[model samples]
Target: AEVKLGSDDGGLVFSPSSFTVAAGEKITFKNNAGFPHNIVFDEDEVPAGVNAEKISQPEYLNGAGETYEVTLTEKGTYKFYCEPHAGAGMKGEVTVN
Candidate 1:
C-alpha cells in the first residue's frame, strides 16, 4: 500500500516512519505540517556508499502541505531524512521486496 507521512515538532519526523512495499511501485511522501522539510536519500538505487551522497530536494510546506513521490523499482533498503534535521535524528527508511 502507498503510505502517507507527516512532519511535526518543528524539526523532522515521519508518521509511521518505517515501511515496506513491493518493488516497481511508487511511494508518495506528503508533508502535513507548516515547517521546513526535505526528503534526502542517503543511498539511492543508482549506487551504494558513493561518498554517502545525499540526494536532497526542495524544502516544502511553506504554507500549504507539499507532496513528494518516488518509485522503488528494485528490492533493497532505502534510507531517507530531513536535511535540516537529519543530524538531530530526523531519519527513516523503507524496505522494498
Candidate 2:
C-alpha cells in the first residue's frame, strides 16, 4: 500500500493513518506535499519477532518528492510517527496479518 506523508490539507500527518496489509506486503511512504518528513517506527511497540530495528531508512526526508519503503514481514501492529512532528500527533499504524 502507499501512504502519503503530506497533502494539500497542510496537515503534518500521514494519509490513511491506519491500515492493514498481509504479511510480506510493502508500504511506500511518499512526500506529496512539499514538506520535510520521515517515518520512525516505535521500536517498543513493534511485536516480538519483528525487528523494527531492521528498518534503516534515514531519519528524515528533507524535501518533497522523496520516498521511503518498508516491507512488513510479520503479523502484528506496526506503529510509527514522524520524527519532527510526532509531538503534534503526526503518527500512523499498520496491521499485518
Candidate 3:
C-alpha cells in the first residue's frame, strides 16, 4: 500500500490521508506530479453494503509514475475524494480489518 496523491510543497493532498488494511489488502493510489489525480468512492461514506461503484477509481491519475490499484474485500470504512482536487481539500480514508 502506498499513497501520495500530491505533496512536496505543491500541496493539494492525500499523502497518507488515512489508511488501514486487511480484508483484501492492496492500495496503491499514487502519483508524484503532473496534475489531475483521481479516486472517487464516498457514496454515502462507503461500507454498509459496499459498492461505491465497486470501490471507484474514475480514471485520470495523470503523469509521474501514476498508479491506482485497489483491493477491498469489504469489511468496513472507506471514504474518498479528489476529482480534480475536490475543491482543494482532496479527502481520503480507508479501513478494512
Candidate 4:
C-alpha cells in the first residue's frame, strides 16, 4: 500500500491516511505536495515482535518525489505521525494482518 504525505488548507495530513495490508508487505509513503514531512511510527501502537528500528525510522522529505518505505512483520494496528506536523493531526495508520 501507499500513502501520500500532503498538506490541506486547514492542516497537514496523509492522504488515504489509514489502510490495511498483509504482514511482510511494504508500505511506501510518498511526498506529494513537497511539504516538509516525515513518518514516525508510535512504538506503543505497534504489534509485538515488530522491529524497533523500523518503528523509529525517519525520512525528512521537503519536496515531491521523495519517499519512505516500511515493512511490517507483525499483525496488528500501527499508528504513525509526521514529526513536524503531528500536533496539526498529520497522522496515519496501517493494519497489518
For all candidates in order, the CA lDDT equals: 0.61, 0.79, 0.80, 0.74
**Sort order, lDDT high to low:** 3, 2, 4, 1
Q: Compute the lDDT for candidate 3.
A: 0.80
User: Candidate 3 on 1-97: residue-level lDDT in tens?
Assistant: 8887878786878888888889988888778763668789878878678788776878665578778788887767889878777888988988888
Better candidate number, 2 or 3, judged by lDDT: 3
Steric clash pairs (candidate 3)? none
- Each model's TM-score, in the order given? 0.68, 0.87, 0.32, 0.81
Kindly list the per-residue Cα lDDT of model 4 for residues 4-91, writing each as its tens digit.
7774443467887888889888788877773778777788776666755555557566766777777877778888887788777788
What lDDT score is found at residue 54 in candidate 1?
A: 30
lDDT of 2: 0.79
Cα distance off (Å), candidate 4, residue 60? 1.9
lDDT of 2 by residue, 1-97 (tens): 9888876686767888899999888888888884678677788898876776676354666766778888987877988877777766788899899
Which whole-number lDDT from 0 to 100 does residue 4 have in model 1? Answer: 40
What's the residue-level lDDT of 52 in candidate 1?
30
Say which prediction, candidate 1 or candidate 2, comes out ahead on lDDT: 2
Of the candidates numbered 2 and 3, which has the greater TM-score value?
A: 2
How well does model 1 score by local distance difference test? 0.61
> Which window of ten consecutive residues has the lowest lDDT sum in model 4?
51-60
Which of 1 and 3 is the better model by lDDT? 3
Runs of candidate 3 exceeding 4 Å displacement: 1-8, 21-41, 49-75, 82-84, 87-91
